[PDB]
Every structure is written in structure tokens, then in C-alpha cells.
Amino acid sequence: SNFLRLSDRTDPAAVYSLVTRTWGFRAPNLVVSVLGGSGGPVLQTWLQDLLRRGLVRAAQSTGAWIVTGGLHTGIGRHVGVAVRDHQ
Amino acid sequence: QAQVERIMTRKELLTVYSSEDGSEEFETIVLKALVKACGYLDALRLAVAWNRVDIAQSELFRGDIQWRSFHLEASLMDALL
Numbered sequence: 001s002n003f004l005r006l007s008d009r010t011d012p013a014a015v016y017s018l019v020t021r022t023w024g025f026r027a028p029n030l031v032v033s034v035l036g037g038s039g040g041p042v043l044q045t046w047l048q049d050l051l052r053r054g055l056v057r058a059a060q061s062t063g064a065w066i067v068t069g070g071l072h073t074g075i076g077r078h079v080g081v082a083v084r085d086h087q
Numbered sequence: 088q089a090q091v092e093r094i095m096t097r098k099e100l101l102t103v104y105s106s107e108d109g110s111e112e113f114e115t116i117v118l119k120a121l122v123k124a125c126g127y128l129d130a131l132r133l134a135v136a137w138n139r140v141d142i143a144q145s146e147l148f149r150g151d152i153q154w155r156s157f158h159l160e161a162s163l164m165d166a167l168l
Binding site for chain 2: 043
């Protein structure tokens with residue numbers, strides 16, 4: 001699970017080149033930048049169904065990237081569990 | 088009436104099988120009743136005791152439950168044994 005530490009004032013071109021070539025990730029046909037604080041660890045059933053069935057399924061079908069916060073909290077945790085369940 | 092009051096004194100144990108138009112979902116109701124009665128015993132260890140993996144899948148899928156290390160370690164040991 002490739003990691004990296006870089007300054008905020010970094011040109012995204014280098015990051016994109018590193019991700020695409022060095023790390024082997026293909027170019028994304030689509031990028032979904034998921035937002036949302038989602039106060040409270042629990043999430044609604046319909047939202048979770050949408051994420052695990054609408055978002056993740058579409059991302060796998062189109063080979064898209066899902067950009068979120070790489071932390072086990074907030075919407076990131078929900079997205080991660082949706083990915084895991086889909087797998 | 089006194090007996091009913093004494094019964095309600097420990098209402099944590101009592102649970103009503105919701106009709107739900109004949110839900111016929113017995114294992115989940117039993118698990119919920121046991122969890123409510125408990126207030127270590129975990130639904131995971133019980134599900135491992137049974138062979139129902141779907142029940143445990145639903146129990147873990149919900150994000151409400153937050154698991155620690157030893158909690159999953161004990162269940163894993165039970166599953167291995």
C-alpha cells in the first residue's frame with residue numbers, strides 16, 4: 001500500500017508521474033473525490049448501500065480512482081468498508 | 088400483578104419476537120436477545136460456535152461496533168480451533 005510524505009507546496013505533476021509510472025497505477029478513466037463529514041460513526045443504510053453498490057461498483061467497472069482522506073474515520077472509514085465489502 | 092411487576096423488574100432478559108408478518112428470521116432474533124441480555128460473551132464468538140458466517144458478516148458489517156485487538160483475536164482462536 002504505497003505511502004509517501006511530501007510538502008503541501010508540491011507540484012501535483014510529480015505526484016501524478018510517480019503514481020502512474022513508478023507505483024504502476026494506470027491512468028484513471030475517472031476520479032471520484034468523496035467529501036462529507038458524516039457526523040457520527042454510524043451511517044444510514046441507504047447511503048451505505050449506495051456507496052457499496054453505486055460508487056464502488058462503478059469505480060471498478062470504469063477503473064476509476066476514489067480520492068478520500070486516508071484515515072480510519074469520517075467518510076473515509078465508510079468508503080473503506082464499502083470497498084472491503086464489495087471485494 | 089405482583090408477579091408481572093417482578094417479571095418487568097428484569098425486563099432486560101425478556102424480548103418480544105416481532106411478528107413482522109412472520110419474519111421467520113430466528114437466528115438473528117436469538118442473537119439480538121442474547122446481546123440485550125448480556126448488556127467475555129460476544130456475538131462473534133457465538134456465531135463462530137455456530138456455522139453461520141452470514142450472521143457474523145452482518146454483525147461486523149455495521150460500523151456501529153468498534154472492535155479491539157483481543158476481541159478479534161479470541162474469535163480467531165475459536166475459529167481456528
